[PDB]
Amino acid sequence: MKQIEDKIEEILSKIYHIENEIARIKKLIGNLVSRLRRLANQTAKSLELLLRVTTEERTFSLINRHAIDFLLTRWGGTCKVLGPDCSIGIEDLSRNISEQIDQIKKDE
Amino acid sequence: KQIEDKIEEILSKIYHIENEIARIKKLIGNLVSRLRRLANQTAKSLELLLRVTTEERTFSLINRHAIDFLLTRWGGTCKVLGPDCSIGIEDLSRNISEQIDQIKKDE
Amino acid sequence: MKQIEDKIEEILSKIYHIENEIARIKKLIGNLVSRLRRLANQTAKSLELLLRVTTEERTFSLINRHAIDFLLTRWGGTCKVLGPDCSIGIEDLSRNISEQIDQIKKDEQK
Numbered sequence: 025m026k027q028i029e030d031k032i033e034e035i036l037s038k039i040y041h042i043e044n045e046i047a048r049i050k051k052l053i054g055n056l057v058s059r060l061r062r063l064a065n066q067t068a069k070s071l072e073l074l075l076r077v078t079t080e081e082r083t084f085s086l087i088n089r090h091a092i093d094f095l096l097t098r099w100g101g102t103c104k105v106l107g108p109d110c111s112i113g114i115e116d117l118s119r120n121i122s123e124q125i126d127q128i129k130k131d132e
Numbered sequence: 133k134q135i136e137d138k139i140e141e142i143l144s145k146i147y148h149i150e151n152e153i154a155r156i157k158k159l160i161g162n163l164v165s166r167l168r169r170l171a172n173q174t175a176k177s178l179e180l181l182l183r184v185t186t187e188e189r190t191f192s193l194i195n196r197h198a199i200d201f202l203l204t205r206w207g208g209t210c211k212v213l214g215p216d217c218s219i220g221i222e223d224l225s226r227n228i229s230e231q232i233d234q235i236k237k238d239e
Numbered sequence: 240m241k242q243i244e245d246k247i248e249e250i251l252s253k254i255y256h257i258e259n260e261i262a263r264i265k266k267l268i269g270n271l272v273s274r275l276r277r278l279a280n281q282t283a284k285s286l287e288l289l290l291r292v293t294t295e296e297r298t299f300s301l302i303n304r305h306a307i308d309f310l311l312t313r314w315g316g317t318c319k320v321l322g323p324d325c326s327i328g329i330e331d332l333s334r335n336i337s338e339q340i341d342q343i344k345k346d347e348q349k
């Protein structure tokens with residue numbers, strides 16, 4: 025069975041290489057998991073900052089409009105001065121944006 | 133003896149390797165779905181921020197129309213404020229839409 | 240023990256197939272990595288564009304406030320007309336946003 029014993033040694037070597045490949049593959053998956061978590065964290069933190077900025081901007085523009093409305097009183101009002109543009113607003117989407125950020129942060 | 137026993141150990145080693153491959157294929161499966169979920173939530177968040185910033189720009193510009201009107205009798209916005217009068221807001225809504233569309237795409 | 244030659248034959252087949260599965264898997268992981276990089280790149284570019292828009296909107300709104308401040312002086316000032324809301328501002332978070340974008344782009348060198 026001299027032929028057989030040679031093949032068995034070959035198969036053992038081949039198996040050893042396969043095990044090492046599988047081990048490397050698991051390290052690569054671990055690393056990819058780490059990267060995905062890291063990107064999610066960085067996305068979440070950025071969206072949180074932009075959400076703060078856009079909410080503060082909306083509030084500040086609305087206060088700017090209150091002043092403008094006051095000023096346009098003697099002129100007959102904002103709608104008479106600007107036309108229908110007067111009724112254009114800024115929808116508050118803070119809750120909707122916070123909702124997506126919360127789902128992103130689930131993977132931290 | 134020796135040869136039947138070596139085959140026995142090889143067979144169980146192959147079983148375990150096949151199981152590990154099956155487990156790795158599931159792990160990669162779940163990773164594909166987690167990456168797609170991230171991309172989808174990113175795109176949805178960006179779409180909302182697109183809407184908010186676009187509306188903010190429009191609203192601010194309408195405020196400026198009112199301000200230009202009111203400053204007319206004082207010599208106009210540029211005379212009153214100086215060169216800051218010319219500072220604008222670049223409309224980047226198409227640029228942002230295009231990025232969102234890229235994130236949403238597969239294949 | 241002619242069965243032995245044949246158990247061996249089946250083991251050699253199985254190994255061949257396992258090798259192909261491994262090649263295929265390394266490819267799938269490579270595709271996942273590239274996909275992850277693509278998303279990072281797209282995220283960073285979208286965030287940069289929103290950084291620009293939000294920065295300009297803050298600047299433009301503050302200028303609108305300067306005009307308003309001028310206009311309200313003769314009614315005794317913005318704070319008199321608006322009340323304490325006059326002091327509400329827009330925090331400049333551009334450095335903070337830019338740092339986070341930079342970290343996304345920075346990861347694209349490893």
Ligand SMILES: [Cl-]
Pocket residue numbers: 084085088191192195299300303
């Ligand atoms: Cl404004």
